[PDB]
Amino acid sequence: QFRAIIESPEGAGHVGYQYRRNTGSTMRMVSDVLDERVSLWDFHCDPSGNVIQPGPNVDSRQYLQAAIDYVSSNGGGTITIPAGYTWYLGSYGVGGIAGHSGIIQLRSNVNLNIEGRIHLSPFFDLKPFQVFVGFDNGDPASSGNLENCHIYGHGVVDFGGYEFGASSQLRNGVAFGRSYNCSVTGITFQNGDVTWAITLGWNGYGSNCYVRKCRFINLVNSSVNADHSTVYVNCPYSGVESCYFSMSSSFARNIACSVQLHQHDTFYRGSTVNGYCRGAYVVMHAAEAAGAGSYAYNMQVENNIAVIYGQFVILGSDVTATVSGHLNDVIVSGNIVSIGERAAFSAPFGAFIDIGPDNSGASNVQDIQRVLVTGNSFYAPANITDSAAITLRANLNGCTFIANNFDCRYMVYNAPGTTSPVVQNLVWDKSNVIGGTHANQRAGQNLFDMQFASVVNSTIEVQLSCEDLSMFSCILFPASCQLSYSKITVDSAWTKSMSNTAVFEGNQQAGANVYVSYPATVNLTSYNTQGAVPFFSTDTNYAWVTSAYSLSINENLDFSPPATYTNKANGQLVGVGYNEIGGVRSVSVRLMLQRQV
Amino acid sequence: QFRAIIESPEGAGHVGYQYRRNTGSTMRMVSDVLDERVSLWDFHCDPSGNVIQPGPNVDSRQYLQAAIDYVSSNGGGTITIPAGYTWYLGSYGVGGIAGHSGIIQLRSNVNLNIEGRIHLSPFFDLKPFQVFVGFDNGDPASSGNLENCHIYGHGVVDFGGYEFGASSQLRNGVAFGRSYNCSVTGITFQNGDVTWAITLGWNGYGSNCYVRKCRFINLVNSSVNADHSTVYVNCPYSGVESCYFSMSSSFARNIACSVQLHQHDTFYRGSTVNGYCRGAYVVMHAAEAAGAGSYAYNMQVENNIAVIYGQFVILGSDVTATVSGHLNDVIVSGNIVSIGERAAFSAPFGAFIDIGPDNSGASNVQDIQRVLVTGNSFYAPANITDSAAITLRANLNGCTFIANNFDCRYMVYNAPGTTSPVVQNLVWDKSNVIGGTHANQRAGQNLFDMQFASVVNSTIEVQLSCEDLSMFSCILFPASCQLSYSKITVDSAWTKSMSNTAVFEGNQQAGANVYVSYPATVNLTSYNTQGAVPFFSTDTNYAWVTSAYSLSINENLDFSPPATYTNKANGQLVGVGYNEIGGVRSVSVRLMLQRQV
Amino acid sequence: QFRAIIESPEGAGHVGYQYRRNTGSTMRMVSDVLDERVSLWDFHCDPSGNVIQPGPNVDSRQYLQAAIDYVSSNGGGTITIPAGYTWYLGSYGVGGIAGHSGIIQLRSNVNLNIEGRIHLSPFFDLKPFQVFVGFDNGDPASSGNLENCHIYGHGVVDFGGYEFGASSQLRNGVAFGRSYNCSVTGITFQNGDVTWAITLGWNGYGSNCYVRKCRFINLVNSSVNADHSTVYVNCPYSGVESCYFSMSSSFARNIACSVQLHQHDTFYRGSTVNGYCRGAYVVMHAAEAAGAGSYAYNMQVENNIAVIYGQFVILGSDVTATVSGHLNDVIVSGNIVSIGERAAFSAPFGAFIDIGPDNSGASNVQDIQRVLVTGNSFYAPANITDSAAITLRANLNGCTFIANNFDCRYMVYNAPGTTSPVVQNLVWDKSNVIGGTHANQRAGQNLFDMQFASVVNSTIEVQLSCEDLSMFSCILFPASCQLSYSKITVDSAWTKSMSNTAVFEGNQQAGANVYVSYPATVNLTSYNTQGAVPFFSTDTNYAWVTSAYSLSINENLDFSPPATYTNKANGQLVGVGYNEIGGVRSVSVRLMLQRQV
Ligand SMILES: CC(=O)N[C@@H]1[C@@H](O[C@H]2O[C@H](CO)[C@H](O[C@H]3O[C@H](CO[C@@H]4O[C@@H](C)[C@H](O)[C@@H](O)[C@H]4O)[C@@H](O)[C@H](O)[C@H]3O)[C@H](O[C@@H]3O[C@H](CO)[C@@H](O)[C@H](O)[C@H]3NC(C)=O)[C@H]2O)[C@H](O)[C@@H](CO)O[C@@H]1O
Ligand SMILES: CC(=O)N[C@@H]1[C@@H](O[C@H]2O[C@H](CO)[C@H](O[C@H]3O[C@H](CO[C@@H]4O[C@@H](C)[C@H](O)[C@@H](O)[C@H]4O)[C@@H](O)[C@H](O)[C@H]3O)[C@H](O[C@@H]3O[C@H](CO)[C@@H](O)[C@H](O)[C@H]3NC(C)=O)[C@H]2O)[C@H](O)[C@@H](CO)O[C@@H]1O
Ligand SMILES: CC(=O)N[C@@H]1[C@@H](O[C@H]2O[C@H](CO)[C@H](O[C@H]3O[C@H](CO[C@@H]4O[C@@H](C)[C@H](O)[C@@H](O)[C@H]4O)[C@@H](O)[C@H](O)[C@H]3O)[C@H](O[C@@H]3O[C@H](CO)[C@@H](O)[C@H](O)[C@H]3NC(C)=O)[C@H]2O)[C@H](O)[C@@H](CO)O[C@@H]1O
Ligand code: NA
Ligand code: NA
Ligand code: NA
Ligand code: NA
Ligand code: NA
Ligand code: NA
């Protein structure tokens, strides 16, 4: 019996131990100390209790699930997935996670320290899957919560390289579910064709979920893949920080986004992206409003580094039959972004900010306002015609740009003959610096191409920092665009040789509450009078001008044109110059035309 | 004897072990390997060495203290507080921590990995307490240091929900003391009525202390609670990053602040706050200047998200009989903040920046300068009368605002008939965007209400981005406010219909070194002369004007008023217009009035 | 035999264990569970397998190397360096690391959890060393990679205080080598005279290497030390975050830099520096371009706090016989920096941004462009003559400044009679706020001292916020500096009493594509005519002026000078004023002179 007890599975339970021989310490057994930790080895055994080695011909799923289920039953703990081994998963889970194509069911308070590698076996080729699932019911609305579940370590989740079998399939790494205080830290997710790597929350249910110091590498690989967002943040008070995202696939340049921020008080910070179509969507979907209300507010995209092929930040909000979503109180700051090398029009239209339609193309459902875009840099190579600081493609209730540096083809753009957004409260401060990479590339183009239904309560203060005489105009409003209660200015620097600076194809600058200024060339004739003598414009399209002043030198000795002008009822400009000697004078002069400024 | 040895507490000390059967590895005993780790179980035992189960009727204090004391004696290590259990504390500690109402005494090099839960028992109801204390003497000035002490894990400190018994009591979670290289990471502090959750340092003594990835939830619950600051940073080279702070109590909206930054080279970054009165104080108290000098400099509040009811950042500095505190070299950047939904005047006056008096109400002791506030967003709902970008309530030696977006009732405010601050070096750049939420709400109010003793070396460049004809003025200086060596401008956009733009109730704009411009309506009469003809203002209050220019169109054919004006000794404006046909002219015109700009 | 087996090193291999008595768990032996972890104790033994205690007379090197080598052979894991002990290293390693003066060779997948202390023994006094080396060959070009190697914990690497023996020696803490997914977290590096603490990558080979939450304290101590950079980042997709850097040595104020960012997609964030010469270099060395190309792009320096004695960020790029390096797409944001207290000229010239020559002094090899410097604060005490926002000492292809607050002696500076940079695309937005600390200190100095060969496509919008009548000028161009296609403006506020505002010593403001404005004092005489009457300047150096306007009041009743002026062919200004009564008038007036603006 002594020997038999010691050799039996209860042997460690008979060997005494006291910490460091301290007579004040608990008199324990070895088993009690070993029981303070737990690994997959404690469950990775045959029906006789003999350990099984992991490998490509072993399905580790049931063993990991048994470990999770047991630790849960004791109120939680942390299960180690050992280093130096690859643990393969080769079958679906059962029960509530089956409605999610789930492999492993996560449980509250049960953390996973992944030090080794978790691979998917070829069972999963061409099939849907969600590797780790925190829902406990196939219907998320009927699911319980997942709380206090953290996945962390130096290890790896490898999706086996398998393509999707059909575009309608879904694949995920970690779905925390209705998740409260859950996180992923340090993990590398790689080698897949998946929809998401990590999802947080469900339709606003959850809180305090985070993804930190994770790597996401090569997670789209086929034309079958319908769509990819690496992290979907669908609960408030949650976010992504200090992560690395990389794709190499052509497909990823057309379909993949790094982050979705879909509920209030969410953030995306300090991360690096390469090879993606898109950086982040910041969106309130009415269809996702159940758990945390109808407003996405306190949305922060800061201090990221990106090389993308489409758009960096995409804003949206939409409606359902019974709910209306709203997006407000957003900050986009400190990001350094560029469109990677590509042919013009070879990926979705390049942009720093996109105001996008809804998923069904509607541009008249959005309620997006109180956005601050400040202190960012954007660059697109000179060949990329389709590059803009903002593509403004749906109704906009406000967006403010201050102190950014935008070096791309367009500043503000929307395609003509497409949507006709209603724009309010678009503010483009004079402190936005417009780069010169695309100088000479702009034939036929307007730098600010105001292809909108209407613009109200808006400010566009254009400041060039180099010449680009190729552009048709600095800013153009088609006659279809109403303009009211707005300030539009074009600083004169680098504009002396421009044929057109600001263009109002419907004469909209004449509006009662339109405040404008821009340079123009004007032909003047004087009267014959020696001495103080009036000069008048030969054209009559200045009835809107409140004052104008000279931007040209006077090469003459015997007279000078007026330094300043106002107008007359018939639309001429008039000012008082000086004839040292009499005579009718005729001059062409560059003027700053001003209205109410 | 073999069997007896094995079953005894030294048994593990007799069972040999060699790592992985490696013949090159140390020949050890099992006990040596078990001795590499340590948990509360190794000390949580009765006088006979039998383990005690934790629970609500067990006081775990003495056992945890014994563990800390023993590990300290070996030069440190990390004690695990096991997952799956709640460890209750039910008595005060003894010795040096007793003067701090202490429960547990922390010791140098002894880290706590809290995986389970630490609860306070009802012994503590209505009483003061500090759960973990790093002082070793009841007099902090006589205390030794705490160094290299880190508290981390997935676990919880729960304060038991108990109210304070008297407002004069103090409660804390972690007081590191005179703390060098100490930190808290990952811990949830919840369910309390406390003064602080964590304090770092003591009166400038300490260094390199941090709070990272912690949660602070529902830490004020009663009207008895005098005051709450969740983290008090009282040593240099220290800070708070990536934390979550939430309150639900009405009381918290009136009393609670998230962070105190009280010594140089301190920071508060990347955190989310909801339900608090205040975000952070940035203060140099003379009474706290012993350990790190009399200056708080290199103070950083960046990239936070907040919903508060009072003020986001509060600046201060003060004096004692023998020490003077100074605050300088501060940056507040990238924050997105809003005043939560509340009635006007129902909480402390809403503000992004407050320049506050000292704790005894004095407004003439401060030395605050070299502050940069840039790239932040602030919003307050339209009903909140008491909302301002800056409430400037005490003497200010400098503060600079660049490229912020402020959407609230006031830009600059101080209450009339209260303090009369002396203001120097207040810079409000034109790149600050003024939102429109409060348009139409401003009857009787001045957007910039300059209720100061004096303003010098200051810049206010007002730029509207929508109309608000309800306001009395854009900026007003009462006659009691001296103004000198300053630049005050009001851009004309959205101002055509304003009765008052800039108001100087003491004619201060006439100062020799005052540089101003703002719009006004002026009535002009001309002489009868055909040809070049002067126009003169009918009022005589323009003796300060250096130039003026038209902001109005000229509806006439037969004449034009001057485009530009200067003045005359008697205070009229004068300019040269043009009478195509003679006659006395009378016009009303909107002018930009300029002085030295 | 039972007893002998149990007492032998295989004893633990005979004692059965089953986790928590769970009948579903693996039937293991105690040794299997102990084998899940590994420490230095498992290798720190004599040839008979008896444990050796560490200490100052024990060389732990061979034991730690044996541990690393063994764990590597099993596919990796984490070796604990135990707390409560100091482990001394006292000899060089052997093999591939010997060409790097290496002590310990790191291996892939083998992490080090340093909880205790690692000290260098006096064997290393006056000698080179690299403590941990990830190269596997003495020739880095012939080295294999290091991957998945993480060093972390609460412990310490102490360099023993030893001085360098010769300036040509190199010393390092961690050289990861050709390093992929390697990191250091939490470690304190202290007490040394070293070249680097940590190097990441080798000549562009590597990826995803990081330094987080580390401390670097007193790592230069002698005049022998040639040069120090605490972290050298020489692989892409890598960076430094949330670290603390401190020096106390006089030598460090002249030689030490905190960070080198030398490859694309690298970052330096959230860190605090004190006592260093320099903050960070951001450089593309042609000599380092092998692994990741010839371009350093996506370079981010954000949200740091620093007290330095030289320059905060230094930009560079250079060439070799066959490679050309390029630097572009850089952002420097949110930093708060100051030059520490020191005498003028007592350390390298103080600067926020330096555009530095190459290591051999060449100023005509650089290709630096697309840089955004925004939302930073800089301060230097008033005595520090040698302090500038930017020292622009080498060719510059672009740099943009928006919304910074610079409080130092110079805004833009280069020494006269030194290099003559070619400058393109230097943009200084009007939103940069110029502080007043150095007011009254600027006798003989130009605030913007444009000591360049040429300036093109540049913008300098000078805005003062207080007077400084000591300065010679706000901006000066020597006649040797060509100026073209540029915008130079001096706002009038605080300039009324300045003798010189903008100075063009070669009359460069007359260029066809130069856009300028600045204040000047001008003497005017009128004709005798009653009524509208011309005024003309008595000097003739205004042939470049397109318009001018009054900045002065008119003290006269009987006449007024013109509000606005243009010029004439002979270089006079001319405008139309008004003589109520006739007579020749003579006045001196402050004008805003304008050219093409
Ligand atoms: C890839 C991506 O994120 N694309 C976003 C786009 O998101 C919408 O389209 C994607 C396409 O993959 C998602 O829609 C697919 O998935 C949902 C959800 O799956 C079901 O519910 C989950 C909980 C369960 O585990 C599954 O087994 C399914 O039963 C399907 O209902 C839908 O038919 C399918 O096309 C995405 O859905 C959201 O997904 C997140 C993350 O898993 C969930 O938290 C949300 O509950 C779910 N929302 C809805 C309303 O169901 C779609 O929302 C965005 O719309 C767009 C703008 O931001 O950006 C990208 O294109
Ligand atoms: C809640 C808060 O932080 N409020 C700040 C306000 O801070 C001042 O008022 C609070 C009120 O709670 C503190 O004053 C109380 O506590 C001090 C300190 O307690 C004593 O010393 C500690 C070390 C010991 O452990 C205790 O047992 C006590 O013996 C009392 O002296 C005082 O009478 C009492 O009202 C706060 O004191 C500071 O507290 C921090 C954190 O613990 C300590 O590091 C400092 O040493 C201590 N300072 C002083 C000068 O004693 C008061 O400073 C701020 O003044 C205000 C502006 O920033 O913001 C909030 O209102
Ligand atoms: C201290 C510092 O970082 N200074 C930078 C300056 O950097 C250059 O000068 C330093 C002086 O210490 C380095 O040059 C010294 O070291 C190199 C490299 O050592 C050799 O290669 C390594 C891999 C091996 O382990 C060693 O045993 C050596 O065989 C010597 O070649 C050189 O002769 C010597 O003066 C620095 O070199 C770079 O160092 C990093 C970090 O270790 C390596 O990753 C690079 O491969 C290596 N580069 C080159 C081209 O060899 C020099 O580049 C910067 O130039 C300057 C501008 O940024 O800022 C600071 O002054
Ligand atoms: Na499903
Ligand atoms: Na329309
Ligand atoms: Na006390
Ligand atoms: Na006064
Ligand atoms: Na070498
Ligand atoms: Na030259």
Check CB contact of B491 with chain C, cutoff 8 Å.
no
Q: What is the dihedral of CA C395, C398, C402, C404, to 10 degrees?
A: -20
Write the DSSP symbol of residue B349: P
Check CB contact of C436 with chain B, cutoff 8 Å.
yes
Radius of gyration of the CA atoms of chain B, in A: 33
Question: Are C358 and C368 spatial neighbours (Cβ–Cβ below 8 Å)?
Answer: no
Strands C573-579 and C531-537: antiparallel
- For residue B367, give Cα distances in angstroms to A65, B373, B394, C267: 62, 17, 10, 35
Q: What angle do CA B24, B27, B29 make, to 5 degrees?
A: 150
DSSP per position, B484-524: ESEEEEE--TT-TT-S-SEEETT-GGGSTTEEEEEEEEEEE
Based on the domain organization, do B83 and B178 belong to the same domain?
Answer: yes
Check CB contact of B576 with chain A, cutoff 8 Å.
yes
Distance of CA A564 from the midpoint of ligand 1 (Å): 62
Kindly report the nearest CA distance between residue B562 and chain C, in angstroms: 10
Contacts of C73 (CB under 8 A, 6+ apart): none
User: Which residue intervals of B528-593 are DSSP H helices?
Assistant: none
DSSP per position, C275-288: EESEEEEEEE-GGG
At B311 the three-state DSSP class reads strand
Kindly report the nearest CA distance between residue B358 and chain A, in angstroms: 32
Q: What is the dihedral of CA A439, A444, A449, A452, to 10 degrees?
A: -170
Tell me the two tokens of residue A307: 């090389």
CATH number for the domain including C569?
Answer: 2.40.30.250
Rounded CA-CA distance B437/C220 in Å is 55
Rounded CA-CA distance C150/C154 in Å is 14
Contacts of C321 (CB under 8 A, 6+ apart): none
Q: Atom 43 of ligand 1 has which residue's CA nearest to it?
A: A202
Contacts of C430 (CB under 8 A, 6+ apart): A430, A431, B430, C461, C463, C489, C491
Q: Atom 28 of ligand 3 has which residue's CA nearest to it?
A: C100
Question: Are C262 and C232 spatial neighbours (Cβ–Cβ below 8 Å)?
Answer: yes
Beta bridge partners of A336: A305, A377
A171 lines ligand 1 (CB under 6 A): no
CB contact under 8 A, B30 and A20: no
Rounded CA-CA distance B208/B250 in Å is 34
Contacts of B400 (CB under 8 A, 6+ apart): B371, B372, B373, B374, B425, B427, B429, C405, C433
Q: How many domains does chain C have?
A: 3
Distance of CA B331 from the midpoint of ligand 3 (Å): 35
Pocket of ligand 3, beta carbon within 6 A: C 100, 140, 170, 175, 195-196, 199, 202-203, 227-229, 232, 234, 260, 281, 283, 285, 287-288, 316, 359
Strands C188-190 and C215-217: parallel
Rounded CA-CA distance C143/C131 in Å is 18
Based on the domain organization, do C252 and C380 belong to the same domain?
Answer: yes
Q: For B269, what's the count of Cα atoms within 13 Å in the CB-facing half-sphere?
A: 28
For residue B594, the one-letter residue type is Q
**Residue ranges making up the domain that contains C37:** 1-78
The number of residues in chain C equals 597
Check CB contact of C66 with chain B, cutoff 8 Å.
yes
Based on the domain organization, do B516 and B502 belong to the same domain?
Answer: no
Q: Which of B197, B202, B206 is nearest to B236 (CA)?
A: B206
The number of residues in chain A equals 597
Check CB contact of A583 with chain C, cutoff 8 Å.
no
**Residue to mutate (ligand 1; options A232, A299, A327; most atoms within 8 A of CB):** A232
CB contact under 8 A, A19 and B11: no
Last residue of a domain, one of A481, A511, A541: A511
Q: Which of A15, A532, A563 lies closest to C564 in CB terms?
A: A563
Tell me the two tokens of residue C146: 């290091």
In SS3 terms, A135-191 reads as: CCCCCHHHCCCEEEEEEECCCEEECCCCCCCCCCCCEEEEECCCEEEEEEECCEEEC
Which residues of B does the annotation place in the binding site? 99
At B527 the three-state DSSP class reads coil
Contacts of B437 (CB under 8 A, 6+ apart): B379, B380, B381, B382, B407, B408
Write the DSSP symbol of residue C142: G
Q: Which of B2, B26, B564 lies closest to C49 in CB terms?
A: B26
Based on the domain organization, do C38 and C94 belong to the same domain?
Answer: no
Last residue of a domain, one of C489, C511, C533: C511
Write the DSSP symbol of residue C13: G
CB contact under 8 A, A43 and C33: no
Q: Which residues of chain B are within 8 Å of residue A295 when distances are taken between CB atoms?
A: none
Rounded CA-CA distance A453/A557 in Å is 50
Q: Locate the DSSP E strands across C340-445.
A: 350-355, 368-374, 377-379, 387-392, 399-402, 405-407, 410-413, 422-424, 426-428, 433-434
Produce one character per residue of C358-393: b if its CB has 16 or more CB atoms within 10 Å, e if not: beeeebebbbbbbbbbbbbbbbbbeebbbbbbbbbb
Chain center to CA of A321: 27
Chain A: partners with 3+ C-beta pairs within 8 Å: B, C
Q: Which ligand is located closest to the Cα atom of residue A482?
A: 5
Contacts of A51 (CB under 8 A, 6+ apart): A41, A44, A45, C26, C28, C32
Phi first, then psi, for residue C252 (nearest 5°) are -60, -35
For residue C402, the one-letter residue type is I
A567: left (phi over 0), alpha (psi -120 to 50) or beta: beta
Q: For B371, what's the count of Cα atoms within 13 Å in the CB-facing half-sphere?
A: 29
Rounded CA-CA distance A413/A387 in Å is 9
Q: Which residues of chain A are within 8 Å of residue B556 when distances are taken between CB atoms?
A: 568-569
Q: Is A76 exposed, middle or buried (0-12, 13-18, 19+ CB in 10 A)?
A: buried
Dihedral of alpha carbons C279, C284, C285, C288, sign: positive
Based on the domain organization, do A535 and A463 belong to the same domain?
Answer: no
Q: Which residues of chain A are within 8 Å of residue C397 when distances are taken between CB atoms?
A: none
Chain center to CA of B87: 35
Question: Are C111 and C146 spatial neighbours (Cβ–Cβ below 8 Å)?
Answer: no
Q: Which ligand is located closest to the Cα atom of residue C225?
A: 3
Based on the domain organization, do B545 and B499 belong to the same domain?
Answer: no
Phi first, then psi, for residue B4 (nearest 5°) are -60, -40
Rounded CA-CA distance A250/A191 in Å is 15
Mutation site, C559, C560, C574, C590, interface B, largest B CB count within 10 A: C560
Kindly report the nearest CA distance between residue A227 and chain B, in angstroms: 30
CATH number for the domain including B409?
Answer: 2.160.20.10
Rounded CA-CA distance A315/A396 in Å is 10
Kindly report the nearest CA distance between residue B80 and chain C, in angstroms: 14
Based on the domain organization, do A365 and A472 belong to the same domain?
Answer: yes
Beta bridge partners of A263: none
Chain C: partners with 3+ C-beta pairs within 8 Å: A, B
- For residue B19, give Cα distances in angstroms to B340, B465, C17, C49: 60, 73, 17, 11
Q: Tokens 């060509």 belong to which residue? A: C482
Q: For C54, what's the count of Cα atoms within 13 Å in the CB-facing half-sphere?
A: 25
Kindly report the nearest CA distance between residue A347 and chain B, in angstroms: 31
Interface of C with B in 160-219 (CB under 8 A): 188, 213, 215
Based on the domain organization, do B9 and B133 belong to the same domain?
Answer: no
Tell me the two tokens of residue A597: 């400024």
Rounded CA-CA distance B7/A12 in Å is 10
Based on the domain organization, do B45 and B162 belong to the same domain?
Answer: no
Asked whether residue A99 is marked as a ligand-binding residue, the answer is yes
- For residue A177, give Cα distances in angstroms to A102, B8, B98, B268: 12, 49, 46, 31
Question: Are A532 and C532 spatial neighbours (Cβ–Cβ below 8 Å)?
Answer: yes
At B384 the three-state DSSP class reads coil
Rounded CA-CA distance B299/B331 in Å is 6
Tell me the two tokens of residue C388: 């500038």
Q: Which of A31, A405, A436 lies closest to C402 in CB terms?
A: A405
Check CB contact of A394 with chain B, cutoff 8 Å.
no
At B65 the three-state DSSP class reads helix
Last residue of a domain, one of A488, A511, A534: A511
A492 lines ligand 1 (CB under 6 A): no
Based on the domain organization, do B69 and B84 belong to the same domain?
Answer: no
Question: Are B244 and B277 spatial neighbours (Cβ–Cβ below 8 Å)?
Answer: no
Beta bridge partners of C17: C28
Q: Which residues of chain A are within 8 Å of residue B577 when distances are taken between CB atoms?
A: 576
Kindly report the nearest CA distance between residue C550 and chain A, in angstroms: 12
Rounded CA-CA distance B111/B174 in Å is 13
CB contact under 8 A, C370 and A42: no
- For residue A82, give Cα distances in angstroms to B492, C107, C241: 69, 18, 29
CATH number for the domain including B35?
Answer: 6.10.20.90
Distance of CA B323 from the midpoint of ligand 6 (Å): 23
Q: Which of B50, B83, B564 lies closest to A78 in CB terms?
A: B83
Distance of CA A230 from the midpoint of ligand 4 (Å): 19
Of ligand 3's listed atoms, the one at least distance from the Cα of C227 is 1
Based on the domain organization, do A336 and A485 belong to the same domain?
Answer: yes
Rounded CA-CA distance C196/A292 in Å is 49
What is the experimental method?
X-ray
Rounded CA-CA distance C182/C164 in Å is 28
A567 lines ligand 1 (CB under 6 A): no
Q: Which of B34, B560, B590 lies closest to A566 in CB terms?
A: B560
Q: Which ligand is located closest to the Cα atom of residue A455?
A: 5
DSSP per position, C57-80: T---HHHHHHHHHHHHHTT-EEEE
Mutation site, A568, A572, A592, interface B, largest B CB count within 10 A: A568
At A526 the three-state DSSP class reads strand
Beta bridge partners of B11: none
Q: Which ligand is located closest to the Cα atom of residue C477?
A: 9
Based on the domain organization, do C29 and C96 belong to the same domain?
Answer: no
Beta bridge partners of B156: B117, B188
Tell me the two tokens of residue A139: 């219907």
The helix or strand, by DSSP H or E, that contains position C562, with its residue range, turns out to be none
Q: Tokens 């307490």 belong to which residue? A: B129
Among all residues of chain B, which has the CA nearest to that of A456? B466
Q: Which of A15, A403, A459 lies closest to B12 in CB terms?
A: A15
For residue C91, the one-letter residue type is S
Q: Is B382 exposed, middle or buried (0-12, 13-18, 19+ CB in 10 A)?
A: middle
Dihedral of alpha carbons C304, C310, C315, C320, sign: negative
